[PDB]
Each structure stands twice: as C-alpha cells, then as structure tokens.
Design a protein around this ligand. Structure first.
Ligand SMILES: CC(=O)c1sc(CCOP(=O)(O)OP(=O)(O)O)c(C)[n+]1Cc1cnc(C)nc1N
Ligand SMILES: CC(=O)c1sc(CCOP(=O)(O)OP(=O)(O)O)c(C)[n+]1Cc1cnc(C)nc1N
Ligand SMILES: [Mg+2]
Ligand SMILES: [Mg+2]
Ligand code: NA
Ligand code: NA
Lengths: 802, 802
C-alpha cells in the first residue's frame, strides 16, 4: 500500500505550505524559462548577456506556468494527504514543467547523476532542454513521473482512467488542454466515469486547463457561456468546480490560499465518495472535475512589441524570439527572469533552498518516484494456465485440415483462465465486439464492468458494476485504457474488427514510439506488458457488412515501426486455433511490444497440432512437409506459400488440386511476418540460408497474402529469390457477398491460386487448364447468384485427411 | 433555390398526412424485412414457404424500424414545408431503410430501371439486398439520397455540418446511433454548432437514435439519468427536446400525431432561428436537437425462443436466424411480415398504393433526388486565378537552388485569390494549424469563422462570425467537414502536421472506398471535387516538437488505395514552391480524388521554374539535366534520385560534392510517386521505356525518399533495374534537435548520401573517403552540441547557381 489513501486533512492548509508552493511555482517558472532560453549562466551572474541566450529558441511557454501552478498544489496535496498519485500532462508540450517537477523533487538527479543540484547541474539542465544531444521538448518517457507524453493530443482521459482501473488506492489528477478537449478522443474520454467503479478502481480528477487559447485561436470551451460549460460537465456525470485567477491584481499568496482551500473541498468530496463506495458500490457518484481558468502564459510580460502576450494565444510557443539578437528582447527576458527573484530561491552554490521544498512529498510518493509512473517496477509475470488443455486435438486424432473450429474461442477459454488466475491484473477491452470476436468464454468468470443504469435481467447479462471486461463503442477508449493499464504494471488484451483498427493507427504509432525511446535509452524505465490486439472479423469474411469493413492495412502501418533492431512490433498470422494459442502465450509473456494477432473468427479448418504450432511460431515460417509432395527443393516446380487463415485454406485446396495433376511443389506457411525481412533489417529474422531452404534458391513462389501484397514485396526486397515471388493480396475488391465471391474477386480463391501456380510453371502448356479454372470461378459465382449460397464443391471440400 | 426554405406551417399536420406516414412506416418496415429474409415471393402469395427464405440471412433489423419511422416524418416535413433537405444515416447498417426510402420515393426505379414498381421489381428488390451480384448492406453510395454510408461509425455530425456550410437553404436531420455517440469523432462532432453561422450556413438537426443498445450492450447515453442527458446537450449549445414511444400500448396513429406535433415545434423554432439570423447573425442560438427514444427493433416480435428481442441488443442484426430451417422460426417470420398488413399497402400487381405515398415530397425535394445528395450535379469548376503570377521567379533570375522561400506561402497567396474568385464555395480547414502551415495569406480576403464568444481585438484577429476558413483542434472535424463540403458540390483544401494526418487514416480509407465504388459502378453519381490535403510541418523539420511529430507514414496508407486503375489516390511531393503551385492547380481541377500534397514549410531552396514544374509534374519523375554531369546513361556511375523537399536539398548538395570529385551521375526528381509503379499496376504510370530512360538499365540508383523506404521498395518491385535501387528513407530516428542532426540520424544528410553514392560505385576504392565523410558527420554533430546551431559549412551551402 502506498501512503494512506483517501484521507481528509480536517485542518486548513498551513501558511508554511502556502509559502513553499509559491516558491515552487516561482522556481519551476524560472527554470522552465531557463530551459527554453539559456545556454549558459543559469543564475544570471555578472555579466549576464545575450551571449548566454540559446541560438535556437524552441519549446513552449504558454501552457507551462499553469502546469507549474497545479503541480505545486498537487505536490502539496500528495504530501499532506500521503496520497498515491500519478498525474497526466495532457498538454505534453509543457515538458519543461515536468522536467522542473522532477528536478525539484530530487528524482531528476537520482536518475540522471550528471544533472546535479547546484549551479553546474542547473546550467546543464537549462542547456539540454530541446537541444542536440539533450532531451526532448515534451513530457517524454525519459522524464521521471511520465506515463503520457502528450505530444499527439487527445489521449489524456483514456490514459487517466486506464491507470486507475483495478488501482483503488491511486489518485490521478488529469490535466487536459482546452485545445486538446476539442479532439474526438478527448471528447469521448469524459464518459469513462460510467465504466469505472468507485470501490474497486481509483479516482480520476479531470482538470481542464482552461487558459483560453490553443496555438492561434481561442478554444471552444473557454468562450461558451459559464452556464453551458457547467451543464456540459454535469451532463457527463461530474460535479464541476471552477477556479478563476490571474486576470486581475489579486496577489499570488491569496491565489494560493484560495486554490488550496478549493482543492481541499474537492479532495474531501473524493474521500467521501471513496468512503461511501465501501458500502454502496452500485450508485455511480458525480465525480468532481475542475475548471481551471487562468491566463495563457501567466506571469510572462503582459505586452511584447505592442502585442498582448500573457492572456493570449501569442504566449503559446516562444515569446521574445529575438532574445539573443536584439537587446530590447534581451532586456525584456532579463526583467522577466528577475521577476521570480531567483536570488531568494537558490543558495550561492546554485542548489534550490530547503525553503522551497520542505512542503514536498518524499520517497515513493514523489511524482517522479511513484512506481505507478514506471509500472514495470511493479509488473509481475502472469500466472498462465498450461496451454495444452486448450489444444484442438482434432488434427492429431483425425488429420490436418480437420473441423470447423471458430479459432478465437480457444483464445477466449485461455483468457478466461488467465483472468481466473490473475483476477485483478488482466483486463479485456472491446469496442462492443468482445462477443462478436468470440472472446465471450471470459464471461464465465467475470462480467463486463458497467457503472451506469441497469434495467432488467431480460437485457443485462454478463454485466455488473465491477468486472474485468470493459466495452465502449470507441477504439480510442479501448486502446488508451489498455495502454495506461500496461504502463502502470498490469496486463490484458483487446479485440477489434480488422478494418476499424485503423481508427487508432496514430495511437499505435505513439505507443510504438514510446517503446522505441524506452528500449533504446531509458533502462531505468522497466519493461511493461505488451499491447496485445486480436485483429479479427477480417477482410475475407465480413458477411453482414461489406466493403467499408474490408481493410487489413494496419499490417502496413505496423511495418513502419520495425527499425534499429528495437523489436517493439510483431505481426502474427494465426493460421488456426492452435497457432493462435501458441502466438498468444508468447504475446502474454512478452514485454515492451505491440503484438498484432490476426485471426479469423469464422468456422475454419485446423491445420497444425499445438506442438507443431509452438515449433513453427518460433521459426516464423515453416514448410508443411506432410503437405508438400516434392522430394527436395530441386524437384519443386512451385513454392505454395500462405499467411492468414483464409489464404491458407485457399492455397491448401489449390495444393490438393495441383497434387492430383502431378504437379510437384512444397507448402510453406508464414506466421511471424517480419521474420521474412533480411538480417540486415532485422537481426532476429530467418537467415538467408534458412530463407532459401524454405523458399528455394530459384523456383517460382506463389505467395497468398492476407493483406496488401505491397507489404510482402517491400519486406523481401533484398532476399535471395525474391524476384520469383508472385504475391497475391487483398486488392480493394469485395462487398456483401458469399465467402467464395470475396476470395474470387481478389484472385485469392483456390481456383485462381491453382491457375496462378500453373502460369508461373508453364503458361503456354497450361493455357487451356487456366481457362478452364477461370471458367469454373465464373460458374461458381453464377451459382451463388442463382442459388443464394456457394457451390457445394467449394464449401464441402476438406483436405485429404479424415 | 430549392423549395421555399424555413417556412412554418401555421396549421396542424393533416389527418391524411398522419395516415400516409403510418402506411409509409408499415411498407418500409415490411420491405426492410423482405430485403433481409426473402429470396422470392415478396407478397407472400400462396404457397408461401421456407423455400422463399434466403439461405444466408445477413443485414440489420434493429436500427431499421426507428429509421423508417423518422424517414416517414422527415418525408412528411419536406413535403409540407417544401424544405430543401439531406438526411444523414449515422447507423449506416440501416441500409434497408435507405433503399426502402428510395424505392418509395420513386428514385430507386428511376436510377435502376430493372427494379420496377410492381411484383417482379419488388421480388428483385428483396433478393438483391446484401446478396452476391446485388447491393450492399449499408447506406452505400449507390443508394439515391446517400452522401454518408455510415459503415465505419463516428462521422455523422462532421458530415452533417460540412454539408450545411455555405448552404443556407439546406436542412440536415442527422440521425446519430447511440452506440455511435460513444465514439471520439461523434463526441466532438456535437460542438460544430460553434463554427457555423445561422445566416450564411444551413441548419443541422441532430437526432439521437436512442434505441437503448448497440450490438451486445446498452449505450452510455441511454442509461445515464434524464437530467444528465439534457444537461449534456444544453451544455453543448442545443435546446434538447425528447420523444419517447413504443414502450407501452399507445396506438401507432397517436404516436404519429404526437411526433408530428413535436417535429413541427422543433421546425418552427428552426424557422424562428433562421428568421432572427437575418437581423442578428452574431448571437449564437441554442439549436434544437432531438432525443428519440424508442425500442431497438421496434415492431418485431417481443420475445423469440424465450429471449427479449424488441427493446434489446438482441434485435441488432438478424432475428430468427433459422427462418429457412425450422418452421417454428418460419411461422414467427410469417406472422411478423403479416402484422404490417401488406395486403393494404400493395395493389394486386404489387405496386405500392397511391394511398401510401400521396403525402410524399415530389421532384428534386425527394430525399433520393435532391442534388445536394449527388453534389457533382451542382458542382461548377473553380474560377482559378492564373498560376504565373505566383511563380517564384528567383530560379529564372538567379539560378536553380536560389533563396529561402517558405513554399506553402505561394499556395496561400493562390488560395487567397481562389477564395476571392469563388467567395462561397471554396473553404479552408485546419486543426488550429492554418497559420502554422503558412496558408494565412488567406486571411487577407476572409476570416476564420467563429460563432462563439469574442473578447477583444487584442486577441481576436482574422476571426468573425462568418468566413471561409474553419479551425477546430480535431483532424476528424477538419476531414469530415471537408468531405461533406465536397459531396454537396463545393471545393476546398485542408492542412495538417504530417504525423497527425494519421489521426484520420481511417476516414481517408472510407472516403477512398466511397470513390472506388463510385468511379467503378455508379455513373449517375457525378464527379465531386477532390480532397486536397496539404501534408506539411514534416518529419525533417519539427523544430519545437520532437519524435512524436515524426511520422510521414500516411504515404503507406495511401498506397493501399491504388488498385484496379480507379485512380482515386495521388501522392505528390512538392519539391519547392513552383512545384507546389503546379501540383495544386492540378489538384484544384481534379475530381473524384484524394490528393496528398507533401510540402515543407521551412525556409528552403527553390529548384525549378514554374514552366519546368508544369512539365515535370505531368511526367511524374524527371531528370534535372542542368544538374546531371554525365553525357548519357552509359557514362552514369550512379543515379541520384530524390522525392521530397529535404531529401532533394541533401541529394543536391551531395551531387555538388560528387561533381567536384569527378564522379559522373545523373539527377532524377520524383514528384508523382505512384507513377513509379509498373503499367501492369498502374495504367497511367511511366512506361518501362520511360522508367529505364530515367533510372538507366543497369546503373546503381541512390534513392533519397521523404518517407519510409519500404514504400518505394514495394512500388518498384517489378520495374527494370529495381535490384540496383538503394532506398534511403525515414527510419524512426530523431528528436528535438538541429536540422542537420535530424537528417544525420536517418543517413539522409548530404554527407551520408555522398558516402552511400561512393559505396554503390566502388566500396573498396572509396573506403577512406567514406570514413572521412562519416567523420565529418560526427564533427558536424559535435559542433551542434557545443555551439547550439549547425556548422556554417552545412547551413551556408547554396547550389552552384547565383
Ligand atoms: C505541440 C503541438 O504539436 C500542438 S499544441 C496545439 C494547441 C494545444 O492547445 P491546448 O489548449 O490544448 O494547450 P495549451 O498550450 O495548454 O493552451 C496543437 C494544435 N498542436 C498540434 C497538434 C495537432 N493535433 C494533434 C492531435 N496533436 C497536436 N499536438
Ligand atoms: C455494422 C457494424 O460494423 C457495427 S454496428 C455497431 C453498434 C452500433 O450501435 P448504434 O447504437 O450506433 O446503432 P443501432 O443499430 O441504431 O442501435 C458496431 C459496434 N459496429 C462495429 C463498428 C465498430 N467501430 C466503428 C468505428 N464502426 C463500426 N461500424
Ligand atoms: Mg489552451
Ligand atoms: Mg443504438
Ligand atoms: Na481516428
Ligand atoms: Na483516430
């Protein structure tokens, strides 16, 4: 247990704490401006000159003094209440406030010993911000206290709420930009309070950083009427409080006293909600939220060159862009830095006075030190049930290609038992698709958590105020909840219809970049569990839906995060259920990855045994010797290669026809896609020798690919024999139609695959056979048209074991 | 002018109209169920049997009877008020309601002559829904009356609001799913009413289709309290009205009378708002919205096999899945279809009785016939200003490589004059980045439209209640507003920081698929203007931001919509301003495309004249002969090839050093990326002969690519000499740093490009030179570290003309 959670003070904030908060605010304002502007001479010792100003002024002042003010008060809160606390910096461009925070709390020097607590350290701290060889401009993963960089805006609230799931002692003040609140993902994020439980989860306090402006515009929320702003948050299930400061001549000490008192009313109400939830955990309370209305750029010069700067979008980035070049700008910078009176805040040796920091929390309650903000220090391996019990044994008993299993059901049974073994640290998310993607065996041990109205057991099933499944019709919520759940040291998986995974492409990009920075250069940030995404209800079998639901292209996005041997991205094609089991165990053990696990949920053949799946997964690609009919590679007329459940089904049927014609070939299945890349691009891929052994040195390869053929072409560009690969993939063809038609129109059906194989072998010789196969596809199509279902010869085919 | 806009009735709805609406509702319910279930015998003539039921039951009943009920009433409204009206079907899976609508209004038979108004036509209409060779399950572009398929949920409100911009006579009832309202994009969509003007734009009426459920869950909005739901919409600037029906025994005729009266109160208030706006166009009114609360699956059987179906998520897709197979299910289907009493709705010949349709609007007021729902019939070509006036003439006067022009500024001046010539039909959108991406010369003739509070000319600049620029911090709003603006026959452009274009990857996917279906098979849907996206503030120069803002990968998404010779996607790299001008004119003339226009906004050299840009754009790729030093292709030791402004700058400097070493090479610039593909993949690409002429038959090619090298590798896989291309692209390296460092860490800087060129030519011979170049990169880096700005030899370099 960290600290003493949800305790009220029952006394006013002390005058000593108010004095320390104003010193904090002034010192973090001063150091934030030093980080942006100063290359040397951080204490402005004589001579202080333009030569001390950075040649390239980059970074953001506007948001920053409001964040420094809240951080003073959140620090004071944490210390007085001993409250386990992670904050979210929605306006992540306020990096300097987050680095100042860590430098003041002592974690910066603890994690970065060269950046010491004295004039030499402070000089280096100022120079390195946004600087070549230095540190980023945003609240990056290399800052102690960050679980959310906030570079791409919109995910502040999904992260805040994912962090408090199953974390009942944790408090998350979530600082949201008022421009950020104009984004889609943030706008839906407010509604998460219908999906957390006040007894079993922790508490988010949204703080709207209503500074009136985004980069070059006012914001929507700051200019609507007060009555609309309050109704809006009340209608989203919050009790709105609002604080207004900085627009008149009110002295800063009164501002701190008024804010501390308000913040204590807010926290008392959170503590009442937490206490009440021990007895009534079914009534959804109105959680407080805070509207925090202060001037953008607060405490910078009111006007610069005749233009209003404090209280304006002009304060957004870097005021005084000529601070190095003019002297008029230099004098303004100088008076601005002086207004904080650093001579009272730093000792002669350049260490921050004890005065400034006596009110601060200590030890693991410090914002930089809390292990929830470095959740790998708390993560434990999952207690995984043995895989063998889930195996589809029909392939051992009856043969390769047996049955009509719905593959994700085996993963559901496995997830069920994971939740049973790990009842408060493994969650499932879905955007209203958990049952649709067949992971509903999980409901045998838990419910979808829903903290909003109930009506009737005739309609409410597998749903309760507490539980380990979470659904909301929003891929942004599912992805963002899961990310923070992982970043705070827990585990889980989510599932999405494949085409809609694209809604969150850009979130995958940011989490991949968080991982990249981390595996490269932040070894104190310990490994977290991986994002595990079941990509299902795929392009080939969207039976109730049509062309809008046919887009397997997240493969292609993921290919753009496969650099430098970071190894933070995996693309797996689950050939069948036993392959799915083997991939999933590996993903549930992995850390520091995004794993995209492709599987069909339609009834489908099971191809491999579990033991086979386990060996084939590890190689990445394997020959299926029981399916090949060639003696060796020299006798092979074509390589039949497949990635995905449906391409594999269609290639298998093609191999069966090709065998019966006396064509000699081998069958290669591809599971771990990126292991096709060269060793030069991927030090864990198949070696050239292993690749040649699979795909031959010079025979034609027919490659039937689940997604866009572009992917495979670009990946094998420098591989031996790559010029002989013919890649067939999805090509933007299809609609609401039968299963054969959907493969037919992309040349993916078995008849077209057989034809393509014949054509690669000898186009002249098999010209008639090819015609005949093409004519057969037409006839099968007409049959579907005339009759309403696919030709029995297509649907009834099973691979020659039985 | 269509109809008589914003006229009140000033009498009750007639009893004849109430009777016709109930007939409409019953006939569209009946035909929606026939489309899902019936392969033959649409009027259930003796014998009516399981043999008439589809073998594959696919499609969605749940949403559909609520949509049919609203459509009856929106039809009645349109007819009585003669109101120019386009509706949005947010729950686009309610396709059968939209096809029924068009069949009833007469547009279906007008656009599809084989689907006639009689028993044979009705039989074909039922069979073809979601059926091989037939029509889609959603409200697809091939349905008259659709400008929004609603397959991927979330964009209902951005489309509705983009449709009414500059469209002051148009009314858009926008039907929103209550599950759909849980998505990010829909949640922010509600706020668009702060960005439209009630005098110069038309009016959206949001209708929340609060049927209580999404696929397998209740919805958030349906289960919060009434007081929260009302406060929510009031806080977003609407006046909420709420209608509740279908949960008790109230007869259907009373339901219609109560709804018609409510809908007339709502429309009267819209008419008051419209009249008032003729005098006060600055006060933002509270626009009505409608909460429409009815049971999901309304009028289907209450219970099926002991499970509550009407009023449940169980009604979502296809009830009675065994209607063909059991007979118990068949009898239920039969009694359900009978409850609508089709014998009163259809004549003996199977035509819908005159009775049913006498209340309907006629001519171009019909929902299927309105030209706003087929906006290419109203689109006119833009009155474009002559391009030559914008040309950067510094290259003619001083030489290739001249100056420090910020390229998008020339496009801004051009957009400015487009708006001046086309003052109410060309709009600019930006997510708070119009000025940042340098398109602000537009503000010389118009303002950012903002219909929300004003404070002071000290802060409010270039902003007014009416204007042709729209900004909101939401890529989903910008993309969705623009799409509907185009679909209703107008024009525009938007700009985004390149990495954040990914927020809307999935919207690009759906608009590309809308285009694909349209250019393939819907010739009555006339061409619309293209999406024009300025992708700027790119990976190489994100100076105030860092690694989160470095992702050029939308190139890769776009590559997945380049099939079948649809030609609906373009990727252009604007080498400089004159190239940008030439691309932009072409994009502003094009139709039926998404055009991604890549350009840097940093100060940069201008390489080509405008006349040259115009010729080079058309070829797609060109040799820059004034830069090459080889006599012919046989004397070439390496091809220096570039796409993007910064790769080109770096390759140019490399060519200058290579020239001075006595290396022989040619320079090829790539503008129209997809013209690298083979003719087999792209019938408008460079022929093999033209490609060889550019890239030689067998010399090494160094290709410096703006985005991920994967793209170029996959595109040229079947090109002559492709094995000799070495593609250098962005490789997930960078942070907040100097411009040289950002190219350096991706091996894109001129020194690394020179080295790579040497290595391709003779690695052994130039081993020392390569070492020396690598050492120089280290020294340049140390210099940036020590000094705070890049080495003068790097920054001060200008191409040898002067
Ligand atoms: C940094 C960056 O790229 C910024 S900061 C900013 C304005 C934020 O205003 P807000 O009111 O939220 O914050 P404030 O500074 O506290 O006032 C924008 C539009 N952007 C570009 C941007 C665009 N779109 C998205 C999704 N994310 C970002 N970061
Ligand atoms: C069709 C499809 O793929 C549907 S329909 C649906 C539930 C919609 O409920 P809503 O309440 O909005 O509509 P209703 O039928 O009127 O009750 C979902 C989750 N989906 C999958 C889905 C997921 N995610 C996104 C972005 N779009 C879609 N279409
Ligand atoms: Mg702001
Ligand atoms: Mg619904
Ligand atoms: Na999105
Ligand atoms: Na998104």
């Amino acid at each position: 247990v960290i600290g003493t959670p949800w305790q009220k003070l029952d006394r006013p904030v002390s005058e000593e704490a108010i004095e320390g908060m104003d010193k904090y605010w002034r010192v973090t304002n001063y150091m934030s401006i030093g980080q942006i502007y100063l290359r040397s001479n951080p204490l402005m010792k004589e001579p202080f000159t333009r030569d001390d100003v950075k040649h390239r002024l980059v970074g953001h002042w506007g948001t920053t003094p409001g964040l420094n003010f809240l951080l003073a008060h959140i620090n004071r809160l944490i210390a007085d209440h001993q409250q386990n606390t992670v904050f979210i910096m929605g306006p992540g461009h306020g990096g300097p406030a987050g680095t100042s925070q860590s430098y003041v709390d002592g974690t910066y020097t603890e994690y970065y010993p060269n950046i010491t607590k004295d004039e030499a350290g402070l000089q280096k701290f100022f120079r390195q911000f946004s600087y070549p060889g230095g540190i980023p401009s945003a609240f990056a993963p290399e800052t102690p206290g960050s679980i959310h960089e906030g570079g791409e805006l919109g995910y502040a609230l999904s992260h805040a709420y994912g962090a408090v799931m199953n974390n009942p002692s944790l408090f998350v003040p979530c600082i949201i930009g008022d421009g950020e609140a104009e984004t889609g993902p943030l706008a839906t994020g407010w509604q998460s309070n219908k999906l957390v439980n006040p007894r079993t989860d922790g508490i988010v306090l949204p703080i709207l950083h209503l500074n009136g402006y985004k980069i070059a515009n006012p914001t929507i929320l700051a200019r609507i009427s007060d009555e609309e702003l309050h109704d809006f948050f009340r209608g989203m299930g919050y009790h709105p409080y609002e604080f207004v400061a900085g627009f008149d001549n009110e002295d800063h000490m009164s501002i701190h006293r008024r804010f501390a008192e308000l913040f204590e009313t807010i926290f008392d109400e959170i503590c009442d909600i937490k206490a009440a939830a021990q007895t009534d955990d079914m009534t959804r309370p109105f959680y407080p939220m805070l509207i925090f209305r202060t001037p953008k750029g607060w405490t910078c010069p009111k006007f610069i060159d005749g233009k209003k700067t404090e209280g304006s979008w002009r304060a957004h980035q870097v005021p005084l862009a000529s601070a190095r070049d003019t002297e008029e700008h230099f004098e303004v910078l100088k008076g601005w830095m002086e207004s904080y009176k650093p001579e009272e805040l730093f000792n002669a040796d350049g260490s921050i006075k004890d005065d400034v920091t006596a009110f601060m929390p200590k030890g693991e309650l410090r914002i930089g030190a809390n292990p929830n903000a470095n959740g790998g220090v708390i993560r434990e391996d999952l207690k995984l049930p043995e895989l063998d019990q889930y195996e589809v044994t029909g392939v051992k008993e009856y043969g390769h290609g047996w049955g009509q299993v719905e593959a994700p059901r085996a993963l559901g049974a496995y997830c069920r038992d994971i939740i049973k073994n790990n009842p408060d640290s493994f969650r499932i998310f879905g955007p209203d698709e958990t049952a649709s993607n067949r992971l509903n065996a999980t409901y045998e041990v838990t419910d979808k958590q829903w903290d909003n109205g109930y009506l009737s057991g005739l309609v409410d099933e597998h749903m309760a105020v507490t539980g380990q499944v979470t659904e909301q019709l929003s891929e942004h919520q599912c992805e963002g909840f899961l990310e923070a759940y992982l970043l705070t040291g827990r585990h889980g998986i989510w599932s999405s219809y494949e085409s809609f995974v694209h809604v969150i492409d850009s979130m995958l990009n940011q989490h991949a970049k968080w991982l990249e920075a981390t595996v490269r250069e932040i070894p104190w940030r310990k490994p977290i569990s991986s994002v595990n995404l079941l990509v299902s209800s795929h392009v080939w079998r969207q039976d109730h839906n049509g062309f809008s639901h046919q887009d397997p292209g997240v493969t292609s996005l993921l290919i753009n995060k496969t650099f430098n041997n970071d190894h933070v991205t995996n693309i797996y094609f689950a050939t069948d259920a036993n392959m799915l089991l083997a991939i999933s165990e590996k993903c549930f053990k992995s850390t520091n990855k995004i794993n995209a696990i492709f599987a069909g949920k339609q009834p489908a053949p099971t191809w491999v045994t579990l033991d086979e799946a386990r060996a084939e997964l590890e190689a990445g690609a394997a020959e299926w010797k029981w399916a090949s009919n060639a003696e060796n590679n020299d006798e092979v007329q074509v390589v039949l290669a497949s990635a995905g459940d449906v391409p594999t089904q269609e290639l298998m049927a093609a191999s069966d026809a090709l065998n019966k014609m006396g064509i000699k070939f081998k069958v290669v299945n591809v599971v771990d896609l990126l292991k096709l890349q060269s060793r030069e691009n991927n030090d864990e891929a198949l070696t050239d020798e292993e690749f040649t052994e699979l795909f031959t040195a010079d025979k034609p390869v027919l490659f039937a690919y689940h997604s866009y053929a572009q992917d495979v072409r670009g990946l094998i560009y420098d591989r031996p024999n790559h010029d002989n690969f013919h890649v067939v993939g999805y090509k933007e063809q299809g609609s609401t139609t039968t299963p054969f038609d959907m493969v037919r129109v992309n040349d993916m059906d078995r008849y077209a695959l057989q034809a393509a194989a014949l054509k690669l072998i000898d186009a002249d010789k098999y010209a008639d056979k090819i015609d005949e196969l093409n004519a057969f596809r037409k006839k099968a199509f007409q049959f579907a048209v005339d009759n309403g279902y696919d030709i029995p010869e297509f649907t009834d085919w099973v691979y020659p074991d039985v």
